Design an enzyme around this catalytic site. Structure first.
Site, PDB file in Angstrom:
ATOM      1  N   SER B 133       0.848  -1.192   0.000  1.00  0.00           N
ATOM      2  CA  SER B 133       0.000   0.000   0.000  1.00  0.00           C
ATOM      3  C   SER B 133       0.882   1.239   0.000  1.00  0.00           C
ATOM      4  CB  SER B 133      -0.964  -0.113   1.173  1.00  0.00           C
ATOM      5  OG  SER B 133      -1.943   0.904   1.078  1.00  0.00           O
ATOM      6  N   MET B 134       0.743   2.152   0.954  1.00  0.00           N
ATOM      7  CA  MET B 134       1.684   3.265   0.958  1.00  0.00           C
ATOM      8  C   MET B 134       3.120   2.787   1.044  1.00  0.00           C
ATOM      9  SD  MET B 134      -0.180   6.051   3.168  1.00  0.00           S
ATOM     10  CE  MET B 134      -1.906   6.370   2.897  1.00  0.00           C
ATOM     11  N   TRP B 157      -0.069   1.940  -2.954  1.00  0.00           N
ATOM     12  CA  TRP B 157      -0.813   3.178  -2.868  1.00  0.00           C
ATOM     13  C   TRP B 157       0.192   4.300  -3.030  1.00  0.00           C
ATOM     14  CZ3 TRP B 157      -1.029   7.865  -0.886  1.00  0.00           C
ATOM     15  CH2 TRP B 157      -2.258   8.536  -0.862  1.00  0.00           C
ATOM     16  N   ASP B 179      -9.316  -4.170  -4.699  1.00  0.00           N
ATOM     17  CA  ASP B 179      -8.774  -3.181  -3.790  1.00  0.00           C
ATOM     18  C   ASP B 179      -9.627  -1.927  -3.816  1.00  0.00           C
ATOM     19  OD1 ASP B 179      -7.090  -1.575  -2.234  1.00  0.00           O
ATOM     20  OD2 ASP B 179      -5.340  -2.643  -3.036  1.00  0.00           O
ATOM     21  N   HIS B 211      -7.538  -5.302  -0.353  1.00  0.00           N
ATOM     22  CA  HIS B 211      -6.309  -4.530  -0.257  1.00  0.00           C
ATOM     23  C   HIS B 211      -5.165  -5.316   0.378  1.00  0.00           C
ATOM     24  CE1 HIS B 211      -3.763  -1.123  -0.236  1.00  0.00           C
ATOM     25  NE2 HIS B 211      -3.884  -0.843   1.051  1.00  0.00           N
TER      26      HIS B 211
HETATM   27  O1  J1K Z   1      -1.876  -0.436   4.368  1.00  0.00           O
HETATM   28  C1  J1K Z   1      -2.293   0.677   4.050  1.00  0.00           C
HETATM   29  O2  J1K Z   1      -1.666   1.512   3.380  1.00  0.00           O
HETATM   30  C2  J1K Z   1      -3.565   1.100   4.582  1.00  0.00           C
HETATM   31  C3  J1K Z   1      -4.141   0.386   5.608  1.00  0.00           C
HETATM   32  C4  J1K Z   1      -5.328   0.813   6.149  1.00  0.00           C
HETATM   33  C5  J1K Z   1      -5.934   1.960   5.673  1.00  0.00           C
HETATM   34  C6  J1K Z   1      -7.213   2.359   6.320  1.00  0.00           C
HETATM   35  O3  J1K Z   1      -7.247   2.664   7.508  1.00  0.00           O
HETATM   36  N1  J1K Z   1      -8.291   2.329   5.560  1.00  0.00           N
HETATM   37  C7  J1K Z   1      -9.587   2.512   6.169  1.00  0.00           C
HETATM   38  C8  J1K Z   1      -9.788   3.961   6.489  1.00  0.00           C
HETATM   39  O4  J1K Z   1      -9.019   4.328   7.622  1.00  0.00           O
HETATM   40  C9  J1K Z   1      -5.353   2.689   4.649  1.00  0.00           C
HETATM   41  C10 J1K Z   1      -4.163   2.255   4.108  1.00  0.00           C
END
Ligand code: J1K
Lengths: 270, 270
Positions: B133-134, B157, B179, B211
């Protein structure tokens, strides 16, 4: 006693219907809106009287779409529901709390705006907040402030729990059993536990739920919609509308006997 | 040709085995470590020779646990793999890129540390990065820099894709079809598209994947482990070890005929 009751004497079937008794329309809020990232005002079109306003805010780097299911769902039951986006996906819970407040302020503003289709539809005293993940942390934060009359954090994520000892707002936390982003053990659970037992509160852990389990869905993964609608709408009815006809769906049932509810806690009666 | 080959001539069965040919041990990295949030160094114990080092970084507000599956998985195939946490869950892709680099630097440092169990085990020229992700945005960012020799973004991401035109690093993007956090349409797909076709690259979209679909799992939802192991290990072998014996698992197969792969793109041959 307050005269905010709307719609028929409810039933589980009404609560779990795809939509509530009211047709819903949507009104766009551009992301140019001050104080949050825009959104969609959902409002019922064939109601009378004024109605509580609810803002539903997403979590980290999540768009409004993530929580949009709640807009039509709640609006259909007699609420003005603005599902919103945040200024930045990077917004943390405190910022999301501020944006929740801004979005509430915005609904209050729009309630007095001749250009808004909800102009004159909102009892601006009667405000609910909902929010997923970091937006649920924001929701819990807003629930400390004394303005909102109901809060439904959805798989809330936040960085500390003791701040939530200040929650006197009726707060229903939907937790997602298998949440790995906002693990119940470190988020929804301590957030719920932090809320005083004198507060009307509920902890509804959705069985097998991943982090999105309380966001609702209109396509695939709709398996929690019944409990979300039943408990969420009733929560908002009970606490925003003071509509005791919805009390029996949040206080009374053996929630854990619901196959979708792995754990229930609450401070019934309210 | 480079002499970095380790282990037997591979097979799908080897690649999809629960573990690779090597027993693994773990060595803790306290979160007090400079430049990232600590982690776990996974390393094989019955290997000879030096090996490439891989850092696996998580996504927003996600702990190392989110991507930890990759540590033992890759280490067992003959890599030193440090699964790490970030300074903050709030760290954005650029910060995660920096922390990836810090973590790589840290493995290089630990390779020269008498107190490290991987002292003398790392060919510090041969560095891979993975990230969810990020963290996958961070991974792609590090892949622009010219130091790493392989990058595997997991459901990456990031906030812009044009920067990834600078990726000459062999980059295998695992995308998660469904995702909704880093939608393929706005993240993995444009990130993959941005990479020059002259770059060894692959886009492996995991069918029905949410995701977390590329993070691996031990028991709960492990349905992508085969493709993750097969393609991820082969990617690292091929590009970190220059091990052409693993080429046939990334270039050759009709990846989309795999029931777990909804879409494959790539620039085979490499
Ligand atoms: O692993 C990631 O990058 C990631 C994990 C969880 C979120 C999240 O919290 N999504 C729901 C809204 O908070 C966002 C990104």
């Amino acid at each position: 006693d307050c005269g905010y009751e709307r719609g028929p004497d409810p039933s589980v079937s009404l609560l779990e219907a795809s939509t509530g008794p009211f047709s819903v329309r949507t009104s766009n809020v551009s992301s140019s809106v001050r104080g949050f990232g825009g959104g969609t005002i959902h409002y019922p079109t064939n109601t009378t009287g004024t109605m509580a306003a609810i803002v539903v805010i997403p979590g980290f780097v999540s768009p409004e779409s993530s929580i949009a299911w709640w807009g039509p769902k709640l609006a259909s039951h007699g609420f003005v529901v603005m599902t919103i986006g945040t200024n930045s996906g990077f917004d943390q819970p405190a910022s999301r709390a501020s944006q929740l407040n801004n979005a509430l302020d915005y609904l209050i503003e729009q309630n007095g705006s001749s250009r808004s289709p909800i102009n004159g539809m909102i009892d601006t005293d009667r405000l609910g907040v909902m929010g997923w993940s970091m937006g649920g942390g924001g929701t819990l934060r807003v629930a400390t402030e004394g303005r909102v009359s109901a809060a439904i954090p959805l798989a809330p994520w936040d960085s500390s729990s003791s701040q939530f000892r200040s929650i006197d707002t009726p707060t229903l936390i939907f937790a997602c059993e298998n949440d790995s982003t906002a693990p119940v053990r470190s988020h929804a659970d301590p957030f719920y536990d932090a809320i005083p037992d004198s507060t009307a509160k509920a902890f509804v852990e959705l069985d097998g739920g991943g982090h999105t389990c309380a966001n609702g869905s209109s396509g695939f993964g709709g398996s929690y919609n019944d409990v979300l609608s039943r408990l969420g709408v009733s929560w908002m009815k009970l606490h925003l509308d003071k509509d005791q006809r919805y009390n029996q769906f949040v206080c009374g049932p053996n929630h854990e006997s619901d196959r979708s509810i792995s754990e229930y806690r609450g401070t019934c009666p309210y």
